[PDB]
Amino acid sequence: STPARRRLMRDFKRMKEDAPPGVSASPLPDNVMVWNAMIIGPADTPYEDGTFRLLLEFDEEYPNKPPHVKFLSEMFHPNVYANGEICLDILQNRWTPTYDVASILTSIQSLFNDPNPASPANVEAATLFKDHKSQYVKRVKETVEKSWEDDMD
């Protein structure tokens, strides 16, 4: 046990009891440095009800240094790259030691309700969102279903 690991244990208590709406996460029973998480596609978005899973990997510099966060589920969002990585200042240059798993998950959750990034990670998704919003939704619906098939395996 170390400062980082204990902090992570505290982040876990908060998720066990006061877990924010639509977000859930938990460390492996044997390794607190690796966590699995899931964000339910928010309300009135084409992402609605999708079970999007992520992988968070921490180190001993936490919470001074953020964890590596990436989506394991196939995604179609202007802020999410092809390898599942996310473009979000909170996770990069704007990170603060006050953040925790909960806040990380909520901040990412919020992106679903605002596909308006300045500089997109997924350019195809950004363009389609502006030009052919009908197709964007069709594509987003496709990933929502795909997230459901994953669980069935």
UniProtKB/Swiss-Prot annotation:
The modification Phosphoserine is found at residue 119. The keyword Ribosomal protein does not apply. The N-terminus is blocked. Pathway: Protein modification; protein ubiquitination. The lineage of its organism: Eukaryota, Fungi, Dikarya, Ascomycota, Saccharomycotina. Its EC number is 2.3.2.23. It catalyses: S-ubiquitinyl-[E1 ubiquitin-activating enzyme]-L-cysteine + [E2 ubiquitin-conjugating enzyme]-L-cysteine = [E1 ubiquitin-activating enzyme]-L-cysteine + S-ubiquitinyl-[E2 ubiquitin-conjugating enzyme]-L-cysteine. It comes from the Eukaryota. PANTHER family: UBIQUITIN-CONJUGATING ENZYME E2. Its main location: cytoplasm. Forms a heterodimer complexes with the E3 enzymes BRE1, RAD18 and UBR1. Also interacts with UBR2, RTF1, PAF1 and the RNA polymerase II hyperphosphorylated form. The interaction with RNA polymerase II is BRE1- and PAF1-dependent. GO terms for molecular function: ATP binding; proteasome binding; ubiquitin conjugating enzyme activity; ubiquitin-protein transferase activity. The keyword Kinase does not apply. This is Ubiquitin-conjugating enzyme E2 2. Belongs to the ubiquitin-conjugating enzyme family. GO terms for cellular component: chromatin; chromosome, telomeric region; cytoplasm; HULC complex; MUB1-RAD6-UBR2 ubiquitin ligase complex; nucleus; Rad6-Rad18 complex; RAD6-UBR2 ubiquitin ligase complex. GO terms for biological process: cellular response to unfolded protein; cytoplasm protein quality control by the ubiquitin-proteasome system; DNA repair; DNA-templated transcription termination; double-strand break repair via homologous recombination; ERAD pathway; error-free postreplication DNA repair; error-free translesion synthesis.
